[PDB]
């Protein structure tokens, strides 16, 4: 239904903020992006950069993905990212998360034509 590119954007992009505002950012974002609909998605990272900057990563440092594929790319520059981790007290449907704000390099998996991110591998 939803495009892989569109899926990465809904799950990992937040260009409208430069950073996680408060400690409640994850609680709010995990829910508005539908990642809490049938279960509490345990982990998720939001990137606070323009789409253009994120798409540009597909042409930066080529590295192996977690699974062995070689279409992974690491940003040369650090980016404003928000780490969301489900806490030990969260119970669906009251999904609860720990918000962690940081500047880190990102690793995404790119595919298609045009060549854009379709998968969030990791942040380092």
Ligand X SMILES: CC(=O)N[C@H]1[C@@H](O)[C@H](n2ccc(=O)[nH]c2=O)O[C@@H]1CO
Site for ligand X in 95-124 (CB under 6 A): 109, 111, 118-119
Q: Report residue 46 as tokens.
A: 């939001």
**14, 86, 117, 119: which is the annotated catalytic residue?**
119
Annotated ligand binding at 43? The verdict is yes
Contacts with a second copy, residue ranges (CB under 8 A):
39-40, 42-43, 61-68, 70, 74, 83, 85-88, 90, 98, 100, 102, 105, 107, 122-124
Cβ partners under 8 Å of residue 100, min gap 6: 20, 82, 83, 84, 85
**9, 12, 120, 121: which is the annotated catalytic residue?**
12
Q: Are 51 and 13 in contact (CB under 8 A)?
A: yes
State the CB neighbour count (10 A cutoff) for residue 75.
21
Active site annotation includes 119? yes
Active site residues per annotation: 12, 119
Annotated binding site: 7, 10, 41-45, 66, 85
């Amino acid at each position: 239904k939803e495009t892989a590119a569109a899926k990465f954007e809904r799950q990992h992009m937040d260009s409208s903020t430069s950073a996680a505002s408060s400690s409640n950012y994850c609680n709010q974002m995990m829910k508005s992006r539908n990642l809490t609909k049938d279960r509490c998605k345990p982990v998720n990272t939001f990137v606070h950069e323009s789409l253009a900057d994120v798409q540009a990563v597909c042409s930066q440092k080529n590295v192996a993905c977690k699974n062995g594929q070689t279409n992974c790319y690491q940003s040369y520059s650090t980016m404003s990212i928000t780490d969301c981790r489900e806490t030990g007290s969260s119970k669906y449907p009251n999904c609860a998360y720990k918000t962690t704000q940081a500047n880190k390099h990102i690793i995404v998996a790119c595919e298609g034509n045009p060549y854009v991110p379709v998968h969030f591998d990791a942040s380092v």
